[PDB]
């Protein structure tokens, strides 16, 4: 591991190395963002040169009729007051930060962004082919200003920011096994319906099988017409106010009757996979950085403490496994006898040996 | 574990011939499935990929209007439609793995299938 | 234009145990992404390194390879027998992925 990252400004003053662009969090520390910034004072045009990371949610107006017209609201965002050394700041420099110098010299100088633990992952809103601008959603960006002071403006060329993902990665200890059951019992007897569901595991990669093992135990003088199977993606986001959905991803309504006073197993495997859900615009997809193709935005891992009402996108996942209960009888289709349980799951990428994210 | 190429054979220049890389052992949506025709010692080169998660499908120009890749991801294959075939596309065709998360070079290739084109 | 991945060396012979290396450049900067392939002929290619750095795993730990920037080495340090393959330089950052004309080893007697 031997390159970095490296994209200057317009009129190239000002130029920004980083170390990567994923920046891991586990649950309880964020990786720091360390880099540098060379200056070329044969163009130090300006008087001051700051620093930020910024996190902030990417929103295209409902009522906006102007195609890419995205704004963007501000839920973290800190400073380094790096170029030049500021009083009293002094602070060791890391791994990294020191080859740079060695590589450029103090030409360039660094700044270490500690990111806190209760913010969201970079986590991108699936566009219709209507909206052409910035992806929506959670990004990232460490910018590169000169402004004589903090109330300064920053010309559109005297500038840089990068796109950085703040991501998550699966958990090596495999959670317990997912089984949700439920009974339901109706009016016309007291002998019961009964539905039991199971994963096979707690944790699966994109693309993997998902084998939900099915188990109705039917007492009942009613009939389980169909049997409706679904993963849904859990969506809390929180710009304003909160808001949440739960679109499904996969599916599968086999058509299996267990009719009345009978067992039934079935095991019905099922993949989610972003080819299918393309049309359902605002789906969460996972941290863009200009515009590639992301996956099924993975789960969003939260704190044993579960802290706040939290910014961003908090995404989670959940097998539905609903039966399709015939009415009828005593109040007709007037009262309704489905059944179902919900299993949730987590979703996300294995850690990577060593090596982080056309033809890929 | 596993993975086979069924099919190929001797085909008039002007013809058809379609291929069946009967996979095993995986998921048809965590891999990125691939077409290498290296031929006999003239070097290596490739045909074809299909990522089945995303729906998409990648061609090496000189297979575009004549070529298709297509994949049943129930039966966990994947094919390849030779419309056209010169005698140039004349090879031993190969199927190749891949990771769709993410793609670091091609895993696992297939005991490979001789196709031959000459009149 | 496609990218090339040219192999300096076309073939070579040389000793059982030593050290081989194999340059190959790409026609631009195709950043990290190359990978390496050995083929005993009459089978199809093991894959040997990914991303340039990174060695496969299941690979023998005497194979890694590098870049100078453009330029792209691979390395391996006390060979064995079954060794006596070709050797592949593969570049997959771009579409098409361009493939290297190939490297013969020989048991050098």
């Known amino acids: 591991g031997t390159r970095v990252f490296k994209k200057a400004s317009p009129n190239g003053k000002l130029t920004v190395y980083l170390g990567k662009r994923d920046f891991v969090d586990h649950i309880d520390l964020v990786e720091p963002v360390d880099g540098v910034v060379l200056v070329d004072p044969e163009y130090l045009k300006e008087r001051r040169v700051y620093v930020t990371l910024t996190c902030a949610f990417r929103y295209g107006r409902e009522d906006l009729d102007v195609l890419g017209l995205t704004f963007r609201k501000d839920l973290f965002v800190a400073n380094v007051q790096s170029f030049p050394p500021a009083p009293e700041d002094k602070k060791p420099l890391t791994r990294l930060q020191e080859r740079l110098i060695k590589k450029l010299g103090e030409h360039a100088y660094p700044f270490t962004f500690e990111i806190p633990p209760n913010l969201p992952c970079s986590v991108t809103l699936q566009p219709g082919p209507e909206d052409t601008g910035k992806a929506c959603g959670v990004d990232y960006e460490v910018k590169a200003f000169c402004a004589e002071n903090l109330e300064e403006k920053i010309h559109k060329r005297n500038s840089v920011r990068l796109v950085i993902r703040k991501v998550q990665y699966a958990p090596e200890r495999p959670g317990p096994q997912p089984t949700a059951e439920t009974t339901r019992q109706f009016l016309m007897s007291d002998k019961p319906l009964h539905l039991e569901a199971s994963l096979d595991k707690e944790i699966y990669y994109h693309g993997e099988p998902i084998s939900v093992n099915v188990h109705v135990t039917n007492n009942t003088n009613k009939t389980v017409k169909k049997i409706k199977i679904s993963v849904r993606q859990y969506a809390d986001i929180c710009l304003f106010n909160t808001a949440q959905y739960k679109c499904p991803v996969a599916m599968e309504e086999a058509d299996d009757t267990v009719a009345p006073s009978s067992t039934f197993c079935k095991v019905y495997t099922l993949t989610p996979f972003l080819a299918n859900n393309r049309e359902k615009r605002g789906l969460a997809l996972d941290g863009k950085l200009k515009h590639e193709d992301t996956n099924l935005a993975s789960s969003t891992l939260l704190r044993e403490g579960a802290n706040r009402e939290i910014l961003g996108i908090i995404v989670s996942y959940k097998v539905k496994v609903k039966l399709v209960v015939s009415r009828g009888g005593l109040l007709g289709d007037l009262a309704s006898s489905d059944v179902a349980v919900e299993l949730p799951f987590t979703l996300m990428h294995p850690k990577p040996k060593e090596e982080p994210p056309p033809e890929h | 574990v596993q993975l086979v190429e069924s099919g190929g054979g001797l085909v008039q220049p002007g013809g058809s011939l379609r291929l069946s890389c009967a996979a095993s052992?995986?998921?048809?949506?965590?891999?990125?499935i691939h077409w290498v025709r290296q031929a006999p010692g003239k070097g290596l080169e490739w045909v074809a990929s299909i990522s089945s998660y995303y729906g998409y499908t990648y061609y090496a120009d000189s297979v575009k209007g004549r070529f298709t890749i297509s994949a049943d991801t129930s039966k966990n294959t994947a094919y390849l439609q030779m419309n056209s075939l010169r005698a140039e596309d004349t090879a031993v065709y190969y199927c190749?793995?891949?990771?769709?998360?993410?793609?670091?070079?091609?895993?696992?290739w297939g005991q490979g299938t001789l196709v031959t084109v000459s009149s | 234009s496609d990218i090339q991945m040219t192999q300096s060396p076309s073939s070579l012979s040389a000793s059982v145990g030593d050290r081989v290396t194999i340059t190959c450049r790409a026609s631009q900067s195709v950043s990290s992404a190359v990978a390496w392939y050995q083929q005993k002929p009459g089978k199809a290619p093991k894959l040997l390194i990914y991303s340039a750095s990174s060695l496969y795993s299941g690979v023998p730990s005497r194979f890694s390879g590098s870049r100078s920037g453009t330029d792209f080495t691979l390395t391996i340090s006390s060979l064995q027998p079954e060794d006596f393959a070709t050797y592949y330089c593969?570049?997959?950052?771009?579409?098409?992925?361009?493939f290297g004309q190939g490297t013969k080893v020989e048991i050098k007697r």
């Open positions: 593969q570049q997959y950052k771009y579409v098409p992925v361009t």
């Open positions: 052992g995986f998921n048809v949506y965590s891999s990125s």
């Open positions: 190749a793995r891949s990771r769709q998360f993410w793609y670091s070079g091609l895993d696992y």
